Design a protein around this ligand. Structure first.
Ligand SMILES: [Zn+2]
Ligand SMILES: [Zn+2]
Ligand SMILES: [Zn+2]
Ligand SMILES: [Zn+2]
Ligand SMILES: [Zn+2]
Ligand SMILES: [Zn+2]
Lengths: 87, 87
């Protein structure tokens, strides 16, 4: 999309995958992350890291479904349907 | 200090503290936080949120002692002694 930004759909495997969300989101991309392969404890760690990542850059965090969340950059205008489609 | 930065010392009581650490760090302040009064689960949540803040803004997370951590902004030159003094 315009201004070097896209939606990165990723599948998480463990807490080290916090860096995958981090790398893309810090570079101005929205990230839609699937936590289906994580334990509830691992998923809580990812969501807390993602909340930190989002707060630092004035982004928005949203829950797509039971296992999928998204981090959206500050000046981005991405609807839930677009994040849902990317998921 | 220069460019709207300081050291903010905080005794933490809950995960509600994440937005307080976040609010100050995102503006370029170093934050030194004592987690002695948190459960082990709450302390892990704070550290995961703080790792997300650090990643987003290229900051440094430093363990001061068993219960005290600090988040230092990217271009800040704060020693361990200064963070220890503020704690
Ligand atoms: Zn494009
Ligand atoms: Zn991995
Ligand atoms: Zn000052
Ligand atoms: Zn300041
Ligand atoms: Zn408190
Ligand atoms: Zn309590």
């Amino acid at each position: 999309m315009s201004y070097q930004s896209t939606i990165v759909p990723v599948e998480l495997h463990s807490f080290e995958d916090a860096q995958v969300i981090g790398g893309a989101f810090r570079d101005g991309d929205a990230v839609v992350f699937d936590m289906s392969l994580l334990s509830r404890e691992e998923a809580r760690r990812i969501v807390d890291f993602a909340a930190g990542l989002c707060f630092a850059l004035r982004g928005k965090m949203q829950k797509i479904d039971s296992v999928t969340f998204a981090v959206v950059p500050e000046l981005s205008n991405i609807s839930t349907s677009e994040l849902e489609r990317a998921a």
